Design a protein around this ligand. Structure first.
Ligand code: HEM
Length: 379
Protein backbone atom coordinates (compact mmCIF):
# COMPACT_ATOMS: atom_id res chain seq x y z
CA UNK A 1 0.00 0.00 0.00
CA UNK A 2 3.00 2.33 -0.35
CA UNK A 3 2.93 5.57 -2.41
CA UNK A 4 6.41 4.98 -3.84
CA UNK A 5 4.68 2.53 -6.22
CA UNK A 6 1.66 4.67 -7.20
CA UNK A 7 -0.56 2.55 -4.95
CA UNK A 8 -3.31 4.54 -3.27
CA UNK A 9 -4.56 3.68 0.21
CA UNK A 10 -8.15 4.34 -0.90
CA UNK A 11 -8.32 3.26 -4.56
CA UNK A 12 -5.35 0.91 -4.85
CA UNK A 13 -3.96 0.50 -8.37
CA UNK A 14 -6.62 2.90 -9.67
CA UNK A 15 -5.46 6.41 -10.42
CA UNK A 16 -6.78 8.52 -7.50
CA UNK A 17 -9.16 11.35 -8.58
CA UNK A 18 -8.23 11.35 -12.30
CA UNK A 19 -8.13 14.49 -14.38
CA UNK A 20 -11.16 15.22 -16.53
CA UNK A 21 -10.02 18.16 -18.70
CA UNK A 22 -7.00 18.93 -20.81
CA UNK A 23 -5.46 22.33 -21.60
CA UNK A 24 -7.36 24.21 -24.33
CA UNK A 25 -4.39 23.38 -26.62
CA UNK A 26 -5.78 19.82 -26.94
CA UNK A 27 -9.44 20.74 -27.52
CA UNK A 28 -9.24 18.99 -30.91
CA UNK A 29 -8.32 15.69 -29.26
CA UNK A 30 -10.89 16.15 -26.48
CA UNK A 31 -13.69 16.80 -28.95
CA UNK A 32 -13.14 13.51 -30.83
CA UNK A 33 -12.77 11.34 -27.72
CA UNK A 34 -15.88 12.82 -26.15
CA UNK A 35 -18.00 12.14 -29.22
CA UNK A 36 -17.04 8.68 -30.42
CA UNK A 37 -20.64 7.31 -30.45
CA UNK A 38 -21.86 10.14 -32.73
CA UNK A 39 -18.70 10.29 -34.88
CA UNK A 40 -18.53 6.50 -35.37
CA UNK A 41 -22.25 6.05 -36.02
CA UNK A 42 -22.34 9.00 -38.43
CA UNK A 43 -19.17 7.68 -40.12
CA UNK A 44 -17.14 10.87 -39.70
CA UNK A 45 -14.60 9.63 -37.15
CA UNK A 46 -11.94 8.55 -39.64
CA UNK A 47 -12.12 11.90 -41.43
CA UNK A 48 -11.83 13.91 -38.22
CA UNK A 49 -8.75 12.00 -37.15
CA UNK A 50 -7.16 12.30 -40.59
CA UNK A 51 -7.68 16.10 -40.57
CA UNK A 52 -6.08 16.80 -37.16
CA UNK A 53 -2.96 18.85 -36.98
CA UNK A 54 -0.08 17.46 -34.94
CA UNK A 55 -0.28 18.77 -31.39
CA UNK A 56 2.80 18.75 -29.20
CA UNK A 57 2.81 16.90 -25.88
CA UNK A 58 4.91 19.53 -24.11
CA UNK A 59 1.83 21.25 -22.80
CA UNK A 60 1.00 18.11 -20.76
CA UNK A 61 2.66 19.18 -17.54
CA UNK A 62 1.91 16.49 -14.93
CA UNK A 63 1.27 12.76 -14.54
CA UNK A 64 -2.51 13.06 -14.31
CA UNK A 65 -2.50 15.17 -17.48
CA UNK A 66 -0.41 12.55 -19.27
CA UNK A 67 -2.71 9.74 -18.13
CA UNK A 68 -5.77 11.59 -19.43
CA UNK A 69 -4.00 12.21 -22.75
CA UNK A 70 -2.99 8.54 -23.00
CA UNK A 71 -6.61 7.57 -22.40
CA UNK A 72 -7.83 10.16 -24.93
CA UNK A 73 -5.39 9.12 -27.67
CA UNK A 74 -5.92 5.40 -27.04
CA UNK A 75 -9.69 5.82 -27.36
CA UNK A 76 -9.31 7.69 -30.65
CA UNK A 77 -6.80 5.09 -31.88
CA UNK A 78 -9.07 2.13 -31.05
CA UNK A 79 -11.97 3.98 -32.70
CA UNK A 80 -9.86 4.79 -35.77
CA UNK A 81 -8.55 1.23 -36.22
CA UNK A 82 -11.86 -0.58 -35.82
CA UNK A 83 -14.32 2.00 -37.19
CA UNK A 84 -17.92 0.83 -36.78
CA UNK A 85 -16.72 -2.55 -35.57
CA UNK A 86 -17.81 -4.81 -38.43
CA UNK A 87 -14.60 -5.46 -40.38
CA UNK A 88 -13.81 -2.12 -42.07
CA UNK A 89 -10.45 -1.62 -40.41
CA UNK A 90 -7.50 0.74 -40.88
CA UNK A 91 -3.95 -0.59 -40.80
CA UNK A 92 -2.13 2.75 -40.63
CA UNK A 93 -2.66 5.07 -37.68
CA UNK A 94 -2.17 8.59 -39.10
CA UNK A 95 1.05 10.44 -38.27
CA UNK A 96 -0.63 13.28 -36.42
CA UNK A 97 -2.05 10.93 -33.78
CA UNK A 98 0.64 8.24 -33.91
CA UNK A 99 3.72 10.37 -33.19
CA UNK A 100 2.33 12.19 -30.09
CA UNK A 101 0.61 9.00 -28.87
CA UNK A 102 3.91 7.10 -29.16
CA UNK A 103 5.99 9.82 -27.51
CA UNK A 104 3.53 10.05 -24.60
CA UNK A 105 3.55 6.24 -24.24
CA UNK A 106 7.35 6.10 -24.10
CA UNK A 107 7.30 8.76 -21.38
CA UNK A 108 4.71 6.70 -19.44
CA UNK A 109 6.47 3.39 -20.25
CA UNK A 110 3.26 1.82 -21.59
CA UNK A 111 2.64 0.35 -25.05
CA UNK A 112 0.82 2.61 -27.52
CA UNK A 113 -2.49 0.71 -27.35
CA UNK A 114 -5.46 1.16 -25.01
CA UNK A 115 -4.86 -0.78 -21.78
CA UNK A 116 -6.70 -1.41 -18.51
CA UNK A 117 -4.86 1.41 -16.73
CA UNK A 118 -6.38 3.81 -19.31
CA UNK A 119 -9.97 2.72 -19.87
CA UNK A 120 -10.48 1.64 -16.23
CA UNK A 121 -7.95 2.96 -13.70
CA UNK A 122 -7.94 6.53 -15.16
CA UNK A 123 -11.34 6.65 -16.87
CA UNK A 124 -13.65 7.76 -14.08
CA UNK A 125 -15.33 10.53 -12.15
CA UNK A 126 -17.21 11.20 -8.96
CA UNK A 127 -20.63 12.66 -9.70
CA UNK A 128 -20.70 14.42 -6.33
CA UNK A 129 -17.21 14.78 -4.79
CA UNK A 130 -18.62 14.58 -1.25
CA UNK A 131 -20.46 11.23 -1.60
CA UNK A 132 -18.69 7.85 -1.53
CA UNK A 133 -17.11 5.69 -4.24
CA UNK A 134 -20.35 3.88 -5.12
CA UNK A 135 -21.60 3.03 -8.60
CA UNK A 136 -24.61 5.37 -8.47
CA UNK A 137 -22.14 8.23 -7.66
CA UNK A 138 -19.60 7.52 -10.42
CA UNK A 139 -19.25 7.86 -14.17
CA UNK A 140 -16.66 7.11 -16.83
CA UNK A 141 -15.07 9.81 -18.94
CA UNK A 142 -15.30 8.07 -22.33
CA UNK A 143 -17.35 5.48 -24.24
CA UNK A 144 -17.26 4.03 -27.75
CA UNK A 145 -20.85 3.52 -28.87
CA UNK A 146 -24.28 4.09 -27.42
CA UNK A 147 -25.24 0.76 -25.88
CA UNK A 148 -21.69 -0.59 -25.47
CA UNK A 149 -22.08 -0.96 -21.65
CA UNK A 150 -18.69 0.73 -21.19
CA UNK A 151 -19.90 2.51 -18.03
CA UNK A 152 -21.00 -0.80 -16.50
CA UNK A 153 -17.89 -2.77 -17.51
CA UNK A 154 -15.35 -0.08 -16.59
CA UNK A 155 -16.92 1.10 -13.34
CA UNK A 156 -17.59 -2.42 -12.04
CA UNK A 157 -13.92 -3.23 -12.78
CA UNK A 158 -12.92 -0.03 -11.01
CA UNK A 159 -15.07 -0.89 -7.97
CA UNK A 160 -13.41 -4.29 -7.72
CA UNK A 161 -10.05 -2.50 -7.80
CA UNK A 162 -11.15 -0.08 -5.09
CA UNK A 163 -12.33 -3.08 -3.03
CA UNK A 164 -8.94 -4.74 -3.46
CA UNK A 165 -7.25 -1.59 -2.13
CA UNK A 166 -8.25 -2.38 1.45
CA UNK A 167 -6.46 -5.73 1.20
CA UNK A 168 -3.49 -4.15 -0.63
CA UNK A 169 -2.84 -1.54 2.07
CA UNK A 170 -2.35 -4.37 4.59
CA UNK A 171 0.58 -5.82 2.62
CA UNK A 172 3.36 -3.85 4.41
CA UNK A 173 1.97 -5.03 7.78
CA UNK A 174 2.62 -8.62 6.62
CA UNK A 175 6.28 -8.16 5.73
CA UNK A 176 6.92 -6.00 8.80
CA UNK A 177 5.28 -8.52 11.14
CA UNK A 178 7.38 -11.25 9.55
CA UNK A 179 10.57 -9.25 9.97
CA UNK A 180 9.79 -8.25 13.56
CA UNK A 181 8.68 -11.83 14.38
CA UNK A 182 5.14 -10.76 15.35
CA UNK A 183 3.01 -13.91 15.05
CA UNK A 184 -0.32 -12.44 16.19
CA UNK A 185 0.10 -9.34 13.98
CA UNK A 186 0.91 -11.48 10.95
CA UNK A 187 -2.19 -13.61 11.57
CA UNK A 188 -4.51 -10.61 12.01
CA UNK A 189 -3.05 -9.12 8.79
CA UNK A 190 -3.68 -12.30 6.80
CA UNK A 191 -7.28 -12.66 7.96
CA UNK A 192 -7.91 -8.98 7.18
CA UNK A 193 -6.58 -9.49 3.63
CA UNK A 194 -8.85 -12.51 3.09
CA UNK A 195 -11.88 -10.70 4.49
CA UNK A 196 -11.28 -7.75 2.13
CA UNK A 197 -10.77 -10.13 -0.80
CA UNK A 198 -14.08 -11.85 0.02
CA UNK A 199 -15.66 -8.38 0.02
CA UNK A 200 -14.19 -7.80 -3.45
CA UNK A 201 -15.87 -11.01 -4.66
CA UNK A 202 -19.20 -9.59 -3.52
CA UNK A 203 -18.59 -6.34 -5.42
CA UNK A 204 -17.85 -8.44 -8.54
CA UNK A 205 -21.51 -9.53 -8.64
CA UNK A 206 -22.60 -6.06 -9.81
CA UNK A 207 -21.30 -6.81 -13.32
CA UNK A 208 -24.60 -8.63 -14.04
CA UNK A 209 -26.63 -5.56 -13.15
CA UNK A 210 -24.72 -3.29 -15.56
CA UNK A 211 -23.30 -5.34 -18.48
CA UNK A 212 -25.36 -7.21 -21.02
CA UNK A 213 -23.55 -10.17 -22.65
CA UNK A 214 -24.59 -9.36 -26.20
CA UNK A 215 -23.43 -5.76 -25.85
CA UNK A 216 -20.05 -6.69 -24.37
CA UNK A 217 -19.25 -9.59 -26.68
CA UNK A 218 -20.57 -7.92 -29.79
CA UNK A 219 -19.62 -4.24 -29.26
CA UNK A 220 -17.28 -3.32 -26.39
CA UNK A 221 -15.02 -6.33 -27.02
CA UNK A 222 -14.37 -5.10 -30.57
CA UNK A 223 -12.92 -1.79 -29.36
CA UNK A 224 -10.80 -3.48 -26.68
CA UNK A 225 -9.30 -5.80 -29.33
CA UNK A 226 -5.74 -5.23 -30.43
CA UNK A 227 -3.30 -6.32 -33.12
CA UNK A 228 -1.25 -9.22 -31.71
CA UNK A 229 -2.02 -12.41 -33.57
CA UNK A 230 -5.19 -10.76 -34.95
CA UNK A 231 -5.89 -11.94 -38.52
CA UNK A 232 -7.50 -8.59 -39.33
CA UNK A 233 -4.18 -6.79 -38.77
CA UNK A 234 -1.88 -9.75 -39.41
CA UNK A 235 1.37 -7.80 -39.09
CA UNK A 236 0.36 -5.31 -36.39
CA UNK A 237 -0.32 -1.61 -36.84
CA UNK A 238 1.75 1.05 -38.57
CA UNK A 239 2.39 4.01 -36.28
CA UNK A 240 3.02 6.44 -39.14
CA UNK A 241 6.03 8.67 -38.58
CA UNK A 242 7.37 6.82 -35.57
CA UNK A 243 8.29 3.29 -36.59
CA UNK A 244 8.70 2.18 -40.18
CA UNK A 245 7.34 -1.31 -39.89
CA UNK A 246 4.14 -2.35 -38.07
CA UNK A 247 4.16 -3.55 -34.48
CA UNK A 248 1.91 -6.06 -32.77
CA UNK A 249 0.38 -5.08 -29.43
CA UNK A 250 -2.13 -7.12 -27.49
CA UNK A 251 -5.57 -5.67 -27.09
CA UNK A 252 -5.77 -6.66 -23.49
CA UNK A 253 -8.23 -5.12 -21.16
CA UNK A 254 -9.89 -6.97 -18.35
CA UNK A 255 -6.86 -9.25 -17.94
CA UNK A 256 -4.34 -6.50 -17.35
CA UNK A 257 -5.29 -6.00 -13.68
CA UNK A 258 -2.48 -6.32 -11.16
CA UNK A 259 -4.84 -7.49 -8.39
CA UNK A 260 -4.76 -11.26 -8.83
CA UNK A 261 -1.02 -11.15 -9.55
CA UNK A 262 -0.53 -8.91 -6.51
CA UNK A 263 -1.84 -11.65 -4.23
CA UNK A 264 -0.39 -14.52 -6.26
CA UNK A 265 3.05 -13.09 -5.47
CA UNK A 266 2.25 -12.21 -1.86
CA UNK A 267 1.18 -15.81 -1.21
CA UNK A 268 4.21 -17.18 -3.05
CA UNK A 269 1.88 -18.86 -5.55
CA UNK A 270 4.60 -19.69 -8.10
CA UNK A 271 2.58 -18.97 -11.24
CA UNK A 272 4.50 -16.20 -12.96
CA UNK A 273 7.35 -18.49 -14.07
CA UNK A 274 6.07 -21.92 -12.97
CA UNK A 275 5.55 -23.58 -16.34
CA UNK A 276 5.26 -22.94 -20.08
CA UNK A 277 2.26 -21.32 -21.77
CA UNK A 278 0.02 -19.93 -19.01
CA UNK A 279 2.97 -18.49 -17.08
CA UNK A 280 4.08 -16.77 -20.29
CA UNK A 281 0.74 -15.03 -20.81
CA UNK A 282 0.77 -13.82 -17.21
CA UNK A 283 4.27 -12.40 -17.61
CA UNK A 284 3.41 -10.66 -20.89
CA UNK A 285 0.43 -8.86 -19.36
CA UNK A 286 2.86 -7.14 -16.99
CA UNK A 287 4.21 -5.01 -19.84
CA UNK A 288 0.72 -3.55 -20.23
CA UNK A 289 0.62 -2.45 -16.53
CA UNK A 290 1.91 0.95 -15.37
CA UNK A 291 5.65 0.84 -14.57
CA UNK A 292 5.25 1.80 -10.93
CA UNK A 293 2.97 -1.24 -10.56
CA UNK A 294 5.33 -3.49 -12.49
CA UNK A 295 7.95 -2.53 -9.90
CA UNK A 296 5.60 -3.25 -6.99
CA UNK A 297 5.06 -6.81 -8.21
CA UNK A 298 8.84 -7.32 -8.56
CA UNK A 299 9.70 -5.87 -5.15
CA UNK A 300 7.05 -8.20 -3.71
CA UNK A 301 8.70 -11.19 -5.47
CA UNK A 302 12.04 -10.27 -3.94
CA UNK A 303 10.79 -10.29 -0.36
CA UNK A 304 10.96 -13.19 2.11
CA UNK A 305 8.32 -15.74 1.17
CA UNK A 306 5.17 -15.51 3.27
CA UNK A 307 4.30 -19.09 2.32
CA UNK A 308 7.68 -20.29 3.63
CA UNK A 309 7.44 -18.35 6.89
CA UNK A 310 4.00 -19.89 7.48
CA UNK A 311 5.20 -23.37 6.58
CA UNK A 312 8.21 -23.10 8.88
CA UNK A 313 6.33 -22.23 12.07
CA UNK A 314 4.40 -25.40 12.92
CA UNK A 315 1.42 -23.11 13.54
CA UNK A 316 -2.11 -24.15 12.54
CA UNK A 317 -3.50 -20.68 13.23
CA UNK A 318 -1.04 -19.18 10.73
CA UNK A 319 -1.64 -21.91 8.17
CA UNK A 320 -5.38 -21.39 8.36
CA UNK A 321 -5.18 -17.61 7.97
CA UNK A 322 -2.87 -18.10 4.97
CA UNK A 323 -5.36 -20.57 3.46
CA UNK A 324 -8.22 -18.07 3.82
CA UNK A 325 -6.35 -15.72 1.44
CA UNK A 326 -5.71 -18.57 -1.04
CA UNK A 327 -9.38 -19.52 -0.89
CA UNK A 328 -10.57 -15.98 -1.59
CA UNK A 329 -8.24 -15.84 -4.62
CA UNK A 330 -9.59 -19.21 -5.82
CA UNK A 331 -13.15 -18.03 -5.30
CA UNK A 332 -12.52 -14.82 -7.27
CA UNK A 333 -11.05 -16.62 -10.29
CA UNK A 334 -13.81 -19.26 -10.16
CA UNK A 335 -16.48 -16.57 -10.31
CA UNK A 336 -14.39 -14.89 -13.06
CA UNK A 337 -14.56 -18.12 -15.10
CA UNK A 338 -18.36 -18.03 -14.83
CA UNK A 339 -18.32 -14.39 -15.94
CA UNK A 340 -16.23 -15.28 -19.02
CA UNK A 341 -18.67 -18.10 -19.83
CA UNK A 342 -21.66 -15.73 -19.75
CA UNK A 343 -19.99 -12.76 -21.56
CA UNK A 344 -17.59 -14.43 -24.03
CA UNK A 345 -18.10 -18.16 -24.43
CA UNK A 346 -21.89 -18.39 -24.76
CA UNK A 347 -22.32 -15.41 -27.16
CA UNK A 348 -19.54 -16.84 -29.35
CA UNK A 349 -21.41 -20.18 -29.61
CA UNK A 350 -24.41 -18.28 -31.07
CA UNK A 351 -22.42 -16.28 -33.64
CA UNK A 352 -18.80 -15.16 -33.11
CA UNK A 353 -13.76 -16.07 -28.35
CA UNK A 354 -14.72 -17.04 -31.91
CA UNK A 355 -15.42 -20.55 -30.52
CA UNK A 356 -11.70 -20.48 -29.60
CA UNK A 357 -12.49 -20.28 -25.89
CA UNK A 358 -11.24 -23.84 -25.31
CA UNK A 359 -7.74 -22.36 -25.03
CA UNK A 360 -9.21 -19.44 -23.08
CA UNK A 361 -10.99 -21.62 -20.48
CA UNK A 362 -7.91 -23.90 -20.25
CA UNK A 363 -5.67 -20.93 -19.47
CA UNK A 364 -8.13 -19.69 -16.82
CA UNK A 365 -8.66 -23.16 -15.32
CA UNK A 366 -4.90 -23.76 -15.14
CA UNK A 367 -4.31 -20.55 -13.16
CA UNK A 368 -7.22 -21.37 -10.85
CA UNK A 369 -6.04 -24.94 -10.15
CA UNK A 370 -2.48 -23.75 -9.49
CA UNK A 371 -3.93 -21.27 -6.99
CA UNK A 372 -5.99 -24.06 -5.40
CA UNK A 373 -2.99 -26.42 -5.26
CA UNK A 374 -1.30 -23.84 -3.01
CA UNK A 375 -3.70 -24.51 -0.10
CA UNK A 376 -1.64 -25.71 2.88
CA UNK A 377 -4.13 -27.78 4.98
CA UNK A 378 -2.35 -29.73 7.78
CA UNK A 379 1.30 -29.55 6.64
C1 HEM B 1 -14.56 -7.14 -13.20
C2 HEM B 1 -13.32 -7.31 -12.76
C3 HEM B 1 -12.30 -8.18 -13.52
C4 HEM B 1 -11.06 -8.39 -13.08
C5 HEM B 1 -10.45 -7.82 -11.78
C6 HEM B 1 -10.39 -9.24 -14.05
C7 HEM B 1 -9.09 -9.68 -13.95
C8 HEM B 1 -8.44 -10.57 -14.79
C9 HEM B 1 -7.14 -11.18 -14.55
C10 HEM B 1 -6.24 -10.93 -13.33
C11 HEM B 1 -6.84 -11.97 -15.58
C12 HEM B 1 -5.55 -12.81 -15.71
C13 HEM B 1 -5.91 -14.26 -15.38
C14 HEM B 1 -5.75 -14.58 -13.90
O1 HEM B 1 -4.89 -13.93 -13.24
O2 HEM B 1 -6.47 -15.48 -13.39
C15 HEM B 1 -7.94 -11.92 -16.52
C16 HEM B 1 -8.04 -12.57 -17.73
C17 HEM B 1 -9.10 -12.46 -18.61
N1 HEM B 1 -10.26 -11.75 -18.37
FE1 HEM B 1 -10.84 -10.77 -16.76
N2 HEM B 1 -11.29 -9.51 -15.07
C18 HEM B 1 -12.48 -8.87 -14.78
C19 HEM B 1 -13.60 -8.93 -15.58
C20 HEM B 1 -13.66 -9.54 -16.81
C21 HEM B 1 -14.79 -9.64 -17.72
C22 HEM B 1 -16.20 -9.04 -17.48
C23 HEM B 1 -14.38 -10.32 -18.80
C24 HEM B 1 -15.09 -10.74 -20.11
C25 HEM B 1 -16.38 -10.53 -20.36
C26 HEM B 1 -13.01 -10.67 -18.63
C27 HEM B 1 -12.32 -11.36 -19.59
C28 HEM B 1 -11.08 -11.90 -19.45
C29 HEM B 1 -10.44 -12.74 -20.42
C30 HEM B 1 -11.05 -13.16 -21.78
C31 HEM B 1 -9.24 -13.08 -19.92
C32 HEM B 1 -8.20 -13.99 -20.60
C33 HEM B 1 -6.99 -13.16 -20.96
C34 HEM B 1 -7.24 -12.44 -22.25
O3 HEM B 1 -7.76 -13.08 -23.21
O4 HEM B 1 -6.90 -11.22 -22.31
N3 HEM B 1 -12.60 -10.20 -17.41
N4 HEM B 1 -8.90 -11.04 -16.00
Amino acid sequence: GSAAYHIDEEVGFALPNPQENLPDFYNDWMFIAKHLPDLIESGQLRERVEKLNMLSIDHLTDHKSQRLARLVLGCITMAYVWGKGHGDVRKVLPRNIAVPYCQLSAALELPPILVYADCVLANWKKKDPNKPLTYENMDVLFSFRDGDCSKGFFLVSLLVEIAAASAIKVIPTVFKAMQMQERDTLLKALLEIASCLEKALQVFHQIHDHVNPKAFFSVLRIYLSGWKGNPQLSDGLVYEGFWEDPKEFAGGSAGQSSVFQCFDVLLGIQQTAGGGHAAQFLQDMRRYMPPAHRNFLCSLESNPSVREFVLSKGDAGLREAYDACVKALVSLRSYHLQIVTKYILIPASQQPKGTGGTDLMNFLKTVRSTTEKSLLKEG
